[PDB]
Amino acid sequence: NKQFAVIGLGAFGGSICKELHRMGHEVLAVDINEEKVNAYASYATHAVIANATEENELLSLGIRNFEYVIVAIGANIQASTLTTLLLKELDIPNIWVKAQNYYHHKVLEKIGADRIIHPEKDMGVKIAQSLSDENVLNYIDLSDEYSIVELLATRKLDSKSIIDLNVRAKYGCTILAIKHHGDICLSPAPEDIIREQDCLVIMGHKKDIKRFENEGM
Amino acid sequence: NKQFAVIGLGAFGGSICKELHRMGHEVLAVDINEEKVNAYASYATHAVIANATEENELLSLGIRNFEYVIVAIGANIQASTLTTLLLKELDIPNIWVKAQNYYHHKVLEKIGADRIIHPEKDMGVKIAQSLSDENVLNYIDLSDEYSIVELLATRKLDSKSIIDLNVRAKYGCTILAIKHHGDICLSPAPEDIIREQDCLVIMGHKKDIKRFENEGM
Amino acid sequence: NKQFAVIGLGAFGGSICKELHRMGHEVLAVDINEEKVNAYASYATHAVIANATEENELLSLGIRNFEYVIVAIGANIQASTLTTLLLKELDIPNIWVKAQNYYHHKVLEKIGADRIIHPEKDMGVKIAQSLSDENVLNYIDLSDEYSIVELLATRKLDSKSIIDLNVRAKYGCTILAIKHHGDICLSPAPEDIIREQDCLVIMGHKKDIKRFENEGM
Amino acid sequence: NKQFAVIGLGAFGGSICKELHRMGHEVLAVDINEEKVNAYASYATHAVIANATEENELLSLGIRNFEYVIVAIGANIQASTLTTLLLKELDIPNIWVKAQNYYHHKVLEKIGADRIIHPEKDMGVKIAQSLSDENVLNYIDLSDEYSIVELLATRKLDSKSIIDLNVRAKYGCTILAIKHHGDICLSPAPEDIIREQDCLVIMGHKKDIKRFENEGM
Amino acid sequence: NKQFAVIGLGAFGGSICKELHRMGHEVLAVDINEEKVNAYASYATHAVIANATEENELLSLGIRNFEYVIVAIGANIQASTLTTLLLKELDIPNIWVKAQNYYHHKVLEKIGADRIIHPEKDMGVKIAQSLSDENVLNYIDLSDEYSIVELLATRKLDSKSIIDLNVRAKYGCTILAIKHHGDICLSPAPEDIIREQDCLVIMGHKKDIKRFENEGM
Amino acid sequence: NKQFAVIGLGAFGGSICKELHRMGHEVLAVDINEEKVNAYASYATHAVIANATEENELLSLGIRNFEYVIVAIGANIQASTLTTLLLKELDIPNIWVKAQNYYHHKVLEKIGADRIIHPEKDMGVKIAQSLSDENVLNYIDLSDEYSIVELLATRKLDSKSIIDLNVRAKYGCTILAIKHHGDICLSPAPEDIIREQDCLVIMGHKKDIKRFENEGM
Amino acid sequence: NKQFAVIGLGAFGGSICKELHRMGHEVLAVDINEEKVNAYASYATHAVIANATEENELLSLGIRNFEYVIVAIGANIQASTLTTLLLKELDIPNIWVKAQNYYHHKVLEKIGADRIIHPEKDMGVKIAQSLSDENVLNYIDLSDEYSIVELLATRKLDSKSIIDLNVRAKYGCTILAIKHHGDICLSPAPEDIIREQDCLVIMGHKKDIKRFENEGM
Amino acid sequence: NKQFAVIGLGAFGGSICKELHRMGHEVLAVDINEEKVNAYASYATHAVIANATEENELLSLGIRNFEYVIVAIGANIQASTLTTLLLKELDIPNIWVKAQNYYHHKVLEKIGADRIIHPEKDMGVKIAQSLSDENVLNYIDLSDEYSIVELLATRKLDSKSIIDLNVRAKYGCTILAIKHHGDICLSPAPEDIIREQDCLVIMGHKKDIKRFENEGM
Ligand SMILES: Nc1ncnc2c1ncn2[C@@H]1O[C@H](COP(=O)(O)OP(=O)(O)O)[C@@H](O)[C@H]1O
Ligand SMILES: Nc1ncnc2c1ncn2[C@@H]1O[C@H](COP(=O)(O)OP(=O)(O)O)[C@@H](O)[C@H]1O
Ligand SMILES: Nc1ncnc2c1ncn2[C@@H]1O[C@H](COP(=O)(O)OP(=O)(O)O)[C@@H](O)[C@H]1O
Ligand SMILES: Nc1ncnc2c1ncn2[C@@H]1O[C@H](COP(=O)(O)OP(=O)(O)O)[C@@H](O)[C@H]1O
Ligand SMILES: Nc1ncnc2c1ncn2[C@@H]1O[C@H](COP(=O)(O)OP(=O)(O)O)[C@@H](O)[C@H]1O
Ligand SMILES: Nc1ncnc2c1ncn2[C@@H]1O[C@H](COP(=O)(O)OP(=O)(O)O)[C@@H](O)[C@H]1O
Ligand SMILES: Nc1ncnc2c1ncn2[C@@H]1O[C@H](COP(=O)(O)OP(=O)(O)O)[C@@H](O)[C@H]1O
Ligand SMILES: Nc1ncnc2c1ncn2[C@@H]1O[C@H](COP(=O)(O)OP(=O)(O)O)[C@@H](O)[C@H]1O
């Protein structure tokens, strides 16, 4: 199929490897810590102990063959950078690297990392958003101004109909889904009822959704 | 306004604190490492050096007053657990804790954490999804089976109309938005055109979306 | 049989282990400090060097088999707590833990310690009672108001009879025992004599006993 | 009234100071740790930050005036010893010192401590006694053979009368008190009932009390 | 004249700054360690305490104005790299950086350092050359095979003439200079004499010079 | 051949060892840091982990046999000094030591170091000279005033003859060599041509060479 | 012969052990630092690694057998004291202990040390005496008034005879020895000569010797 | 009078300063530890806090004026060495330095210390001498082989005459003095009696004196 190499079996890298393996892709789990290799042996096609900063070991892995290599080392800046550089000189098509801080991001950028990810920082922003607003369970930003939001229904919304809560005209937003006791309603008709503590999926402008949260719920 | 306490200024905690501070909330950044306290001094209301496992220090912080306390320590399990337990005993309303593994999740659960977050595991699943399918930019899971997906349009989709790509009947999914050159089209009509390299927002069953990805694009 | 495990060979734990061993019970003395293990090797059935916060070591001890486990670590709160949690998850019937302060007591309480002991605090109250009243050698409180007290006889009590010192009617208290030159008299008859420097065991109300001490001796 | 000096506000010293202050005695709480002084300022007449090993500070406290000085430092042997020596040379009438081990006890003995206390060791013996016999809540030893014991009543004792349980004749021991739901009965008459889970106060020979526990409850 | 910025007043950087200042150039000596700034205050035009990794401080220095900026930080890789990057984004014409190891050299190379110097490594090669051959005081390599060498004259060369030591025909090398007691003779005539302990400057092939060293001196 | 001992595998020492090994000399690489020993194992005859300040280890190395011992420790003054002294008492013929500062130089001098080297300071002077004058590729100073300089030819020198550029009479300097495309011309005749970007080797007075650089190129 | 135990191989203890071993006595060198044990292995009968504060180790050494035990630990007061006490309870005949300060001296005294030595303080007094008076090289006091003094001969004494310097009649003192260029003359005859810079050994009254120093030399 | 500088108020240095001050000499007590300066303030002319390794502080002390400077730092080799070097370059007439080990002695020697003292080692030799022989009270070594010894007389010597104990012919040694009940006899005649427990002063060869101790007493 496609070939993925995950170097550094941290929580993030480990998750990548485990999930990718669940999808049934060829995943090479590389790790200098023996116990990590032993841990993810069940969760990979091939799990190898290797020092990814050592070039001959990287050649012994045959890493050139892989379409995607992911450097999930985000504590040891030197190791991460060095590995990324090695892979770049080894002409890897796609090099995705976990970064720790803005400047490690910078050096990764300059040595030509293809995609740089800050999992903790991002997820942190998300959890902070959920923290300031207990009503937002999840969301996705379509753009700087437009977004789809998942909301936890309050008492103000109990036994209310979609036609009763006219979001399409009053707030310019559109409701997409209602999740009640695990049961799910996609693109629901105006007659449908929303009961409290249910999942509500609205779509529109950020400020408009905020407005609806304010006066509506 | 609201009062937030962020204990452990890692990348995740640090991000929470920084972002929350950008929102203009009262954020107490707590950290046993002095340099971390000095680092996020600009991005908090009050930045304090404290051993969160040492309780008298926790009383010296006056943490009982806070509505939300975030334990963003995810490497030192013992520290995290001890701190969370301490906060629970101090009758803190909302305790959100970062977990490292399933078992740390378990002990947090049993000592009554209010919300447990796995930033790296989740983000890992997301990036893995993006890895197996270069065409998925982002997504949100409504449930175990149902999801809203953001797609990168290929050449197979160029100059194709929404009525041409009948997703609502052929695949049971519904298109929600089209992003073309930064311009944005919300809940578009069947006459609208999709050009390649544009953002496409589909909604439906996971397997169905996969189907459409397979035969459609 | 019943097997007792004493983790932490301090003065308190060490005393427990030594005394229990003198009683002829099967006692496992656990200690991360080698010299402590070597110290109490003579006073236990099995003395083992182990890190009780490390789960695999706790399994290597086979601690699950034990009816009673005593955590006598009272300086290192973190260690104590982690250990107690470990034992609880390992379904130990009776977990008795030494505590340092009110809140360490609390955290032990929430993670389900079966009995929490404050040796220094208690003993402190007792010695303080002995300090404010030079006459009291020892005592036991039956309740908030009622108590049995051991008293050191002064010259005021020399050659005095029980009927002479009518405590049962004049002070509402009752004399229980007289210890003279090591010889012992239990529940003595009214004809019996009390000589100075002897042990006197009175029983009654605290304030009443104080009265008898005041006007009597 | 009387003047007490408590040096070292640990759990033991702290307890002494707090309790003595509750009795309304003049207690000087001395401590090199500022936070401890701040902690027990409410529970002493004068709470001072001082290094008790430094002689000029000890004169600055005016410790010569005190009838009783208590050295409650039991971890730092050198500090305890040095302090005790200082107090001895300053002709203090009564010097009571907390000890850690047998040899610290020895050096305290040799430099002329007036009373040496091992709170943890003693309390440890007591709790161990309570461990080998679940029925004993508390006790006091009148001598090597004779003792007064507090017992937790089992189902075997429920709804039983004092005359029914003839301890004075069958076992040579005498019942002193019965505590039922917090209510208290001192030196109860033979008609009185003992209900389960109540506190029972027996007095007699150790082996005899053991006998009564064996066949009786 | 020209404007030089020396960041990091180590031995190497300090030497650069001092020497440059002796030549009468405008040299800005920058250093986060105050005592270093105080040390080279006499040997610079402007000596400033600054964190060169902090951008606003770098603007406060007005570093954009300088033609040459020298990063003489070679122990703290992160600091060096970071500074170099900052300078690069600020469009500095010439950035010369001291490197520690091959990989620090690599990252400097990739973030676009203009000249990278390894003082210890080079000087090391030179001193090693002097070690294997006690006769060489100094030298310069014209190419892989051809070189000009400074030699310490031995007794075999004492009172010997240039025509006596026919290097131009016997060894294919040419003598360039003779230094006697500080006095100096450039391109000396064949009648000229060489005395021991004098500086002799020969020019030719490496192996040929070695030959002359072998049989000649 | 000859035997060299390199103690302290820094950049300087490491360079010495590597270069000497390239020359094919017997080099003992000594280092207290295991990873350094492992690093230069390929670049030495024998690479040993040793604390050079410990005498018995120094005898275990058999360092007395070596003609040359190099102390390349330049951060840890005490280590360097102690080691050098050790070697001196062991009657080592030649002890060359890396120095950090003027006073470390002094103590090395007083304990009888045979040659003391300051690589960073020297090389620093050189780089400073190259900094104030961008034109010089390399050089060697014969004395305070007289020098041989290697110059990079500009367009002003293209297609010019040696007789055309009369340096011997107009500037009192003499051209020694011309390097064109790797090809090399030693002591060239006046008919020879200099093409731009070639290496030019001039010899004479510093100020005179400066003059020639100014008006000539 | 006799058996000596030297605990603590410092400079003082080490000197004791080495010297005693040179005399050919059975010396047990005990030390918790392995390297010290390895150091004095050549200079003892048996050199053992042991923690002298640990009683079971002290029994493992078989220290009860020894006539003399020397505690040469003078930095670690607690170790010294604890050890000394240990030896005392083990009924050691002679316990000689090195002391640090007056109070450590006190506690050693009180726990029954047989001889307490202050090497640095004493030797300090001596060197101070030599400092205030350059003429005295060494001396021994026979009593408060009478003494034997070693003097450095000055120029006033050069080429002078014993009969010339009539000390027995003019100064009431008697010359005992003359040391010239290492050669030694015991109880020299009146014809004997004193040369400058030689060692002169006078005997008599202190004030008389001072007198001779004044008027004679 | 004369001016002494004592740098480093240890036990040895402190002793020097105190004793010298008792003699009434001008003593400058220098110490980087403030508490030491405060301790010996009563026992010096001027007691100053100074870092003796810092040259400007040494000039601030005005140390050039002093005839004698004593470096009594014997734990911190670097401090001692650096200071000694500083004093030497400042041309102090007499520099006496305390040494720790043979190599520190060496570096002191090489940087030109005037007198080097090993108090612990020496005093150690003395105490060892007293240990192997309980009879020797004091002594002075004239040379490696020759010595004057003070001896405690045993019962073997009681009521014995000098002519009876013919040491001058039988052992080649000479008796110099007899101290009886505080009374003193200098250079006693052969008729004089020696009684036990008296001080006996013999002079001669070491082995010979040992011989006399063996067969005589
Ligand atoms: N030089 C290297 N070569 C190969 N793997 C490395 C190297 N350095 C680090 N790693 C890998 O990184 C992993 C540790 O990552 P971790 O420290 O857990 O990240 P985080 O601290 O962000 O959780 C280890 O399993 C190790 O295999
Ligand atoms: N017991 C504790 N008390 C207070 N702060 C702590 C404690 N343990 C860890 N921390 C803080 O947590 C931070 C480390 O978080 P980090 O390990 O970076 O999270 P992650 O591994 O998810 O990136 C440190 O800055 C440290 O100060
Ligand atoms: N993580 C741990 N695992 C095992 N034992 C521990 C741990 N932490 C502490 N201990 C035990 O506690 C013992 C000492 O307790 P101590 O500090 O003396 O209590 P206190 O200070 O109250 O006297 C040590 O000997 C050690 O074995
Ligand atoms: N030199 C000293 N002078 C005054 N107080 C001291 C000194 N040394 C220790 N202490 C006191 O001892 C107390 C700590 O005792 P602690 O270590 O808790 O005993 P334990 O560990 O046996 O419970 C501190 O409050 C401190 O003030
Ligand atoms: N970010 C920075 N900004 C300014 N100066 C710095 C920075 N980082 C390091 N320095 C300076 O560099 C110097 C250290 O250089 P050094 O480590 O001695 O080089 P080397 O190890 O090559 O001798 C310090 O004096 C410090 O002031
Ligand atoms: N006691 C010692 N014995 C032997 N080698 C030592 C000792 N102390 C330091 N070294 C050597 O010094 C080297 C480190 O020098 P380094 O700190 O890199 O100097 P700098 O910091 O000036 O570059 C190490 O390779 C180590 O082997
Ligand atoms: N309890 C102990 N048992 C055995 N050896 C000890 C003990 N305590 C200290 N020592 C030894 O004493 C030596 C240290 O003496 P040191 O501190 O150098 O004396 P000083 O400070 O007077 O020079 C060490 O080698 C150590 O091994
Ligand atoms: N560089 C220095 N300048 C001034 N005083 C110093 C310096 N280094 C050490 N000292 C002083 O020397 C004293 C330590 O002597 P110490 O180590 O007790 O000698 P010893 O080890 O022989 O007992 C300390 O009081 C300290 O203040």
Author numbering:
A (entry chain E), B (entry chain F), C (entry chain A), D (entry chain B), E (entry chain G), F (entry chain H), ...: 6 to 222
Authors' account:
KtrAB is a cation channel with a nucleotide-dependent RCK domain. The structure of the KtrAB complex revealed a homodimeric membrane protein (KtrB) assembled with a cytosolic RCK octameric ring, formed by the KtrA protein. KtrA binds nucleotides, ATP or ADP. ATP binding induces the adoption of a square-conformation by the octameric ring and increased K+ flux activity through KtrAB; ADP binding results in a non-square conformation and decreased flux.
A simple indicator of ring conformation is the pair of distances (L1 and L2) separating the Cα of N38 residues located in opposite subunits across a ring face. Like in the wild-type protein, the ADP-bound R16K (at 3.0 Å resolution) and R16A (at 3.7 Å resolution) rings adopt a non-square conformation. However, the ADP-bound ring conformations are different from each other and from the wild-type, with L1/L2 distances for the wild-type of 40.7/30.7 Å and for R16K of 52.0/21.9 Å. In the ADP-bound R16A mutant there are eight KtrA dimers present in the asymmetric unit, corresponding to two different rings with L1/L2 distances of 34/30 Å and 37/28 Å.
